[PDB]
Amino acid sequence: YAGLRTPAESFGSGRGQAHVPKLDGRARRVPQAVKGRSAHPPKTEKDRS
Amino acid sequence: TELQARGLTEKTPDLSDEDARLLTQRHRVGKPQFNRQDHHKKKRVSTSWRKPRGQLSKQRRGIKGKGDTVEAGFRSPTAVRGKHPSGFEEVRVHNVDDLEGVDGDTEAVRIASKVGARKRERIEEEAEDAGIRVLNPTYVEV
Amino acid sequence: GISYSVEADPDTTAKAMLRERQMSFKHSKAIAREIKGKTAGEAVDYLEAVIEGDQPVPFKQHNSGVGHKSKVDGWDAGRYPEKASKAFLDLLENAVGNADHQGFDGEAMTIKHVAAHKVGEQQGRKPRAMGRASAWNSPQVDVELILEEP
Amino acid sequence: AEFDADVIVDARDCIMGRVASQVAEQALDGETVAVVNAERAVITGREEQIVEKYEKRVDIGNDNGYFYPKRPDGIFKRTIRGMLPHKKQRGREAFESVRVYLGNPYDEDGEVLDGTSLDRLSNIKFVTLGEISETLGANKTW
RNA sequence: UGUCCCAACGUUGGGCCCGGUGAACUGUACAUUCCAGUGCGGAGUCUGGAGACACCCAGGGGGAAGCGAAGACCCUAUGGA
RNA sequence: CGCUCUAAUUGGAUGGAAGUAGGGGUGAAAACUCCUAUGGACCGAUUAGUGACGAAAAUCCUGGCCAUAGUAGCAGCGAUA
RNA sequence: ACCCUCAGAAGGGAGGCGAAAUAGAGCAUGAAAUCAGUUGGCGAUCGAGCGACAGGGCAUACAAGGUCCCUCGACGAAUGACCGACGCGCGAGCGUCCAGUAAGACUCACGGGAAGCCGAUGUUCUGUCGUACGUUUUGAAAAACGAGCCAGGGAGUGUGUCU
Ligand SMILES: [Cl-]
Ligand SMILES: [Cl-]
Ligand SMILES: [Cl-]
Ligand SMILES: [Cl-]
Ligand SMILES: [Cl-]
Ligand SMILES: [Cl-]
Ligand SMILES: [Cl-]
Ligand SMILES: [Mg+2]
Ligand SMILES: [Mg+2]
Ligand SMILES: [Mg+2]
Ligand SMILES: [Mg+2]
Ligand SMILES: [Mg+2]
Ligand SMILES: [Mg+2]
Ligand SMILES: [Mg+2]
Ligand SMILES: [Mg+2]
Ligand SMILES: [Mg+2]
Ligand SMILES: [Mg+2]
Ligand SMILES: [Mg+2]
Ligand SMILES: [Mg+2]
Ligand code: NA
Ligand code: NA
Ligand code: NA
Ligand code: NA
Ligand code: NA
Ligand code: NA
Ligand code: NA
Ligand code: NA
Ligand code: NA
Ligand code: NA
Ligand code: NA
Ligand code: NA
Ligand code: NA
Ligand code: NA
Ligand code: NA
Ligand SMILES: [Sr+2]
Ligand SMILES: [Sr+2]
Ligand SMILES: [Sr+2]
Ligand SMILES: [Sr+2]
Ligand SMILES: [Sr+2]
Ligand SMILES: [Sr+2]
Ligand SMILES: [Sr+2]
Ligand SMILES: [Sr+2]
Ligand SMILES: [Sr+2]
Ligand SMILES: [Sr+2]
Ligand SMILES: [Sr+2]
Ligand SMILES: [Sr+2]
Ligand SMILES: [Sr+2]
């Protein structure tokens, strides 16, 4: 759930801004966002044997 | 009273005629810079080479003036490729034992930068006695 | 903060510095530029004349909208930055003071080196229309001065 | 005011364009040329159509400006400028070592360049630079 | 009856110059342009000419198909309400 | 070719490691390497592996910063001080 | 610490400590963007994808590169003469012989020379070519879309099954 604990939403078109989820004026959740989730991180379910 | 470099500083390797010829060719022909397209137009774009991939790229399309594109045809002569300009083949050395098996007539030695002064002194005096030139010699005031 | 950016022979030189002064950085470049090479005493008289309004300071770089001044030589735009001038008078006061304490003829020394450097901004915020606020800052300026025997 | 010309060309009864072409050629080869008797230079064709063309050039213009010369002096020099890359260093240099004159300010007579001569006994459809200038409204100072 | 013929003079606050304070919009790059042409047919940047010494102040806004808003019109989506 | 960490084999470092800056050499190239200054404690090579492994771009994200600019505003309200 | 300066517990100067204060308080290192001062090159008559490749100017402590230039001679691929003689053409000019000769890129040897001198690096000038990049597109310099600049961040991953 790292990076997913936020209700951040995108404003969409209109304010001359990239459609990126934001909360309190901060971009969040998405992989390109600082403090966002890891896109393809190490996973516990992976069989390493 | 003046700085002097240790070792066989002026030593030259002995090359077959064909090798001296090819070494001379490489040096005369040279090659283009081969820097990345438009690296000069944007600071965030470094000089390190990257194949131009734009569908419309002028360099990719091979337009005269946009610089040469890396191709095998630019390779240097096999017989000389990699040689130090002096003609010597270089051998990376980290200690005195690395000097073993090195032919001073054909190879010159390059002491890794990490190596300290104490160990460099030993390596430098052992290479000279072995008739091996050291490309990056220590300068002492003699 | 800065460090003197030029070498100085202690035996024939005297130094001084201003720190984090809240004054126009742009005015400081203009003033430094104008007094360099002058004598401490000449610089002082010059700056007093600027504050008095009898001598304009050439504004050669930060000159947009600035009106021409007949007394400006070789250039057109100039002004009378009294605030930054007074700060430079404190610098010269300190400099010449140090110079004399060392046995030199303070006022007589040449301003060998003098340069202003922007060390930062004291940040401020100003409420604007439409529920937004924008920057309203103060420049922070360091300035170095090296006096040297003729 | 004194012009050490290596060559003094006499444009009298000579086809302007043909002289201009040779003076440009020589100027580019480093020669300093003085064209004399410009008002007497000549241009073949119907006087009425020739003048219309030069009148159109006088009328063209705007704020940016299209300053076209009216004196035979300048007409000829502009003609030469059109055969020189006057905006290039070498071209401006050549052009600047060329001068045209009304009458002959020299004591030495000019020479008639081969192939540029017009024979009045065999031609009737031609005009004179002086005539053109007068029509254009120039002040016949020559 | 200054809405108009047809505009004038005046008043107060700005505007302009000086001290202090001191933002924002906008910025691929280059950029002194003009006339024609060409080009995905609506070019400061391509071609040909023309013009062009650098910098600065004030101005009214012709152009940058100016800036501001992933066109609201129209159609399309095995979209929504 | 380059990056991380693991293992085996094997090396470098306070007689100055990594990093950074400027500079020399090699390689078609990814990139490798040396010199000098700074720095003041760690750093490789080969082989077999491991992978949150390579950016110029997404009106991409966050931080920092320049031009804009000593520019707009600090006048306008029946309360001109 | 002490002293000097100052309206001054500010700041500055000098000084003391320590291997180091360019370790003096968001105080290990200290990139880029970018700012001040300054060095080299260019610069107030001249033109715009900012360069690539050639070639000139000017600039250069050492180290890590050491070459380069001129006479002559040797070798000498494709190519390839002048002149002279003879013979044709109205003419421009051509043919035959001289002759596949002289010449001919590179490379080398002898003799002489250069050390800012050769390379290289900075900048500038000349020549040739040249209207970014990525994307959308039949067609992009585009008056189609994206970005102010830099640094860092930023996209084929796991389980199961199948082939
Ligand atoms: Cl290969
Ligand atoms: Cl500022
Ligand atoms: Cl005109
Ligand atoms: Cl030209
Ligand atoms: Cl006739
Ligand atoms: Cl060869
Ligand atoms: Cl993939
Ligand atoms: Mg995270
Ligand atoms: Mg770049
Ligand atoms: Mg103004
Ligand atoms: Mg409100
Ligand atoms: Mg839309
Ligand atoms: Mg509708
Ligand atoms: Mg519905
Ligand atoms: Mg091994
Ligand atoms: Mg990265
Ligand atoms: Mg890309
Ligand atoms: Mg403005
Ligand atoms: Mg620090
Ligand atoms: Na939360
Ligand atoms: Na597992
Ligand atoms: Na200026
Ligand atoms: Na003046
Ligand atoms: Na004046
Ligand atoms: Na004619
Ligand atoms: Na005209
Ligand atoms: Na009225
Ligand atoms: Na306008
Ligand atoms: Na944006
Ligand atoms: Na050069
Ligand atoms: Na697109
Ligand atoms: Na494009
Ligand atoms: Na277009
Ligand atoms: Na901004
Ligand atoms: Sr909309
Ligand atoms: Sr080292
Ligand atoms: Sr300015
Ligand atoms: Sr000719
Ligand atoms: Sr043009
Ligand atoms: Sr206006
Ligand atoms: Sr990644
Ligand atoms: Sr700013
Ligand atoms: Sr008031
Ligand atoms: Sr108001
Ligand atoms: Sr001290
Ligand atoms: Sr031969
Ligand atoms: Sr970045």
Please provide the DSSP assignment of chain B as one string.
Answer: --EEE-S-TT------HHHHHHHHHHHHH-----PPTTGGG-TTS-SS------SS-TTTTT-TTS-PPP-GGGPPPTTTTT--TTSPEEEEESSGGGGTT--TTTEEEEE-TTS-HHHHHHHHHHHHHTT--BSSPPEEE-
C27 touches strand E (CB under 7 A): yes
φ and ψ of C68, to 5 deg? -65, 155
Q: Which ligand is nearest to the CA of D125?
A: 5
B40 touches strand F (CB under 7 A): no
Q: Ligand 10 centre and the CA of C64: distance in Å?
A: 7
Q: How does DSSP classify residue D111?
A: B
Length of chain B: 142
The tally of CA atoms less than 13 A away on the side-chain side of residue C125 is 4
**Mode of pairing for the β-strands spanning C138-148 and C13-21:** antiparallel
* Distance between CA atoms of residues D55 and D133, nearest Å: 10
A22 touches strand F (CB under 7 A): yes
**Ligand 3 is a single-atom ion; what residues have CB below 5 A from it?**
D 61, 65-66
Name the percent of chain C in helix, strand, coil, to the closest 5: 35, 30, 35
Chain B: touching chains (3 or more CB pairs < 8 Å): none
Report which secondary-structure segment, H or E, holds A2. Answer: none
Length of chain D: 142
The tally of CA atoms less than 13 A away on the side-chain side of residue B19 is 16
Interatomic CA–C1' length for residue B133 and nucleotide G55, angstroms: 37
Is residue C106 a contact partner of residue C74, using CB atoms and an 8 Å limit? no
Q: Ligand 35 centre and the CA of A12: distance in Å?
A: 9
Closest-lying nucleotide for C62 based on CA to C1': F70
Interatomic CA–C1' length for residue B94 and nucleotide F46, angstroms: 14
- The residues pairing with C143 across neighbouring beta strands, listed in sequence order, are C18, C116
Report which secondary-structure segment, H or E, holds B14. Answer: none
Closest CA to C56 of C40, C75, C79, C39: C79
Is residue D129 a contact partner of residue D17, using CB atoms and an 8 Å limit? no
Residue type, position A6, single letter:
T
Enumerate residues 6+ apart whose C-beta is below 8 A from D36.
D8, D9, D10, D11, D100, D101, D103, D104, D105, D106, D110
B91 burial via Cβ count (<10 Å: 0-12, 13-18, 19+) = middle
Interatomic CA–C1' length for residue B23 and nucleotide F11, angstroms: 33
A17 touches strand E (CB under 7 A): yes
Start-end of H helices in chain B: 17-29, 117-129
Q: Ligand 37 centre and the CA of C64: distance in Å?
A: 6
Interatomic CA–C1' length for residue C45 and nucleotide F59, angstroms: 56
Residue by residue, DSSP assigns C47-90 as HHHHHHTSSPEE-SSS-TTPPB-TT-SS-SBEE--HHHHHHHHH
B57 touches strand G (CB under 7 A): yes
Is residue D75 a contact partner of residue D133, using CB atoms and an 8 Å limit? yes
3-state secondary structure of D85: coil
* Distance between CA atoms of residues D11 and D34, nearest Å: 10
- Domains: count for chain D: 1
Length of chain C: 150
The tokens for D88 are: 């290039």
Report which secondary-structure segment, H or E, holds B90. Answer: strand B89-93
**Mode of pairing for the β-strands spanning C138-148 and C133-135:** unpaired
In this complex, the residue with its CA at the shortest distance from the C1' of nucleotide G47 is D87
Breaks in chain B, named by the residue before each, with C–N above 2.5 Å?
A: none
Domain encompassing residue D99: 1-142
| Assigned CATH topology for domain C1-150 | Ribosomal Protein L22; Chain A (3.90.470)
- The residues pairing with C113 across neighbouring beta strands, listed in sequence order, are C146
Interatomic CA–C1' length for residue B62 and nucleotide F57, angstroms: 23
- The residues pairing with A9 across neighbouring beta strands, listed in sequence order, are A22
Give me the resolution in angstroms, 1 decimal: 2.3
| Bases in strand G with any atom closer than 7 Å to a protein CB | 4-6, 8, 11-15, 22, 32-38, 46-47, 49-54, 62-68, 106-108, 120, 125-130, 132-137, 140-141, 149-160
Q: Which residue has the tokens 């064909």?
A: B18
Closest-lying nucleotide for C137 based on CA to C1': E22
Is residue D44 a contact partner of residue D18, using CB atoms and an 8 Å limit? no
Break chain C into its structural domains and give their ranges: 1-150
**Mode of pairing for the β-strands spanning C133-135 and D33-36:** unpaired
Q: Ligand 31 centre and the CA of B131: distance in Å?
A: 65
Q: Label residues C2-18 b or e (16+ Cβ within 10 Å = b).
A: eeeeeebeeeebbbbbb
Closest CA to B94 of B63, B68, B116, B71: B116
* Distance between CA atoms of residues D135 and D75, nearest Å: 13
* Distance between CA atoms of residues C25 and C83, nearest Å: 11
Angle at D40 between CA D35 and CA D42, to 5 degrees: 95
| Cα distances (angstroms) measured from residue A47 to each of B20, B127, D70 | 58, 54, 94
CB neighbourhood size of B109 (10 A) = 23
Is residue D91 a contact partner of residue D34, using CB atoms and an 8 Å limit? no
Residue type, position C43, single letter:
A
D80 burial via Cβ count (<10 Å: 0-12, 13-18, 19+) = buried
Q: Which residue has the tokens 């100085």?
A: C8
* Distance between CA atoms of residues B105 and C89, nearest Å: 72
Angle at D104 between CA D101 and CA D108, to 5 degrees: 130
| Bases in strand E with any atom closer than 7 Å to a protein CB | 16-24, 26, 28-29, 33-35, 49-52, 55-58, 68-71
Helices (H) and strands (E) in chain B, counts: 2, 4
| Bases in strand F with any atom closer than 7 Å to a protein CB | 11-18, 25-31, 33-35, 43-44, 51-53, 56-62, 65-66, 68-72
Start-end of H helices in D1-142: 16-28, 47-59, 72-81, 89-96, 129-136
C66 touches strand E (CB under 7 A): yes
* Distance between CA atoms of residues B135 and B85, nearest Å: 11
* Distance between CA atoms of residues D83 and D24, nearest Å: 6
Is residue D54 a contact partner of residue D136, using CB atoms and an 8 Å limit? yes
Length of chain A: 49
Domain encompassing residue B48: 1-142
Q: Ligand 17 centre and the CA of D112: distance in Å?
A: 67
Residue type, position A49, single letter:
S
The tokens for D42 are: 């000549």
Strand order across the D7-10 sheet: D7-10, D33-36, D98-100
Is residue C106 a contact partner of residue C42, using CB atoms and an 8 Å limit? no
Residue numbers 79-138 of C with CB closer than 7 A to any atom of strand E: 79-84, 122, 124, 126, 134-138
D56 touches strand E (CB under 7 A): no
- Domains: count for chain B: 1
3-state secondary structure of C92: helix
The tokens for C150 are: 């003729």
Closest CA to D98 of D33, D25, D21: D33
| Cα distances (angstroms) measured from residue D140 to each of B91, D131, D136 | 88, 9, 11
3-state secondary structure of D99: strand
Q: Ligand 34 centre and the CA of C32: distance in Å?
A: 30
C74 touches strand G (CB under 7 A): no
Q: What is the CATH number of the domain that holds D112?
A: 3.90.1180.10
* Distance between CA atoms of residues A48 and A44, nearest Å: 9
